[PDB]
């Protein structure tokens, strides 16, 4: 149904809301939720752990089956697997983990995976355990994504800093 409500429109195609991505998925019933994935689709932490828990581990079981046959993703890459109870599809997208020395330049490749989907519910890529500057990630999102992206930021203080930064 893609019933996004209460978003702030930043650009013609980028929207943001102070919200929990799991509660947004349940409310909105998106066609596609983006996972903040790692290359082995091991969803023990970060947004990936929250999504997986909300699928009662179905996302991890599917991901383990996928990886054993298909091999890992690349940093900046993606795959499309089931959205389970959260969405029709899950676009697993690997942003660079700058806490572990990966190239922040790959955040552009990471966001280019969104352009194959008309509308997405998504987290800010490379935030949290991936260690990237969120203000930078929002800029790369706005510069790179052409399709409609609805970003969910749960931390209110970070949300407020992102909106204040974007309106400068
Ligand atoms: C949760 C869920 C499941 C199946 C779904 N299909 C669609 C669609 O856009 O056709 C959205 C959606 C959301």
């Amino acid at each position: 149904v893609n019933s996004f409500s209460g978003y702030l429109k930043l650009t013609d195609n980028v929207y943001i809301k102070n919200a929990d991505i799991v509660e947004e998925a349940k409310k909105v019933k998106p066609t596609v939720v983006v996972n903040a994935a790692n290359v082995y689709l091991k969803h023990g932490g970060g947004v990936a752990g929250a999504l997986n828990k909300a699928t009662n581990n179905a996302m991890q079981v599917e991901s383990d089956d996928y990886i054993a046959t298909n091999g890992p993703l690349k940093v900046g890459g993606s795959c499309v697997l089931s959205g389970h109870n959260l969405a029709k599809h899950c676009l697993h997208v690997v942003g660079p983990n700058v806490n572990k020395g990966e190239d922040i330049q790959l955040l552009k490749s990471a966001y280019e995976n969104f352009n194959q989907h008309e509308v997405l519910l998504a987290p800010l890529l490379s935030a949290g355990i991936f260690g990237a500057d969120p203000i930078h990630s929002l800029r790369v999102c706005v510069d790179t994504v052409r399709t409609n992206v609805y970003l969910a930021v749960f931390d209110k203080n970070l949300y407020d800093k992102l909106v204040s930064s974007f309106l400068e």
Side-chain angles (χ1 to χ4, degrees):
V1 325
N2 294 306
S3 58
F4 296 96
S5 69
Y7 282 77
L8 173 68
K9 183 171 213 161
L10 297 184
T11 70
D12 283 342
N13 68 296
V14 181
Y15 296 84
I16 197 172
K17 190 177 175 183
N18 178 208
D20 174 356
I21 194 171
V22 169
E23 289 310 308
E24 283 297 297
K26 292 176 174 174
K27 285 178 175 185
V28 168
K29 298 181 187 294
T31 304
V32 183
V33 63
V34 173
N35 184 32
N38 54 32
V39 290
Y40 296 105
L41 304 180
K42 283 291 192 183
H43 311 301
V47 166
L51 297 175
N52 178 57
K53 182 174 178 190
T55 77
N56 293 66
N57 203 53
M59 178 179 286
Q60 187 64 76
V61 166
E62 174 196 35
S63 295
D64 289 344
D65 175 68
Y66 172 86
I67 291 288
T69 289
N70 296 284
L73 283 67
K74 66 178 186 177
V75 180
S78 69
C79 66
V80 174
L81 292 180
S82 178
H84 301 282
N85 53 298
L86 300 178
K88 185 178 181 181
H89 304 295
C90 183
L91 179 72
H92 292 273
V93 176
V94 181
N97 189 321
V98 301
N99 286 327
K100 295 195 63 161
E102 299 175 348
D103 183 2
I104 194 59
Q105 296 180 293
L106 287 164
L107 191 56
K108 174 177 174 284
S109 182
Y111 278 114
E112 288 171 350
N113 295 285
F114 291 23
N115 283 329
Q116 286 55 256
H117 302 271
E118 196 169 55
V119 176
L120 313 89
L121 170 65
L124 199 67
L125 296 185
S126 296
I129 64 183
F130 288 82
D133 188 336
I135 291 181
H136 177 61
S137 184
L138 178 59
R139 290 177 185 146
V140 179
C141 180
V142 162
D143 292 345
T144 307
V145 180
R146 295 193 190 168
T147 52
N148 291 315
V149 55
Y150 288 84
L151 290 169
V153 179
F154 182 65
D155 177 329
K156 167 64 166 160
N157 291 325
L158 173 60
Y159 173 85
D160 284 345
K161 278 197 14 103
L162 288 166
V163 170
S164 173
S165 165
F166 201 71
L167 290 176
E168 283 173 358

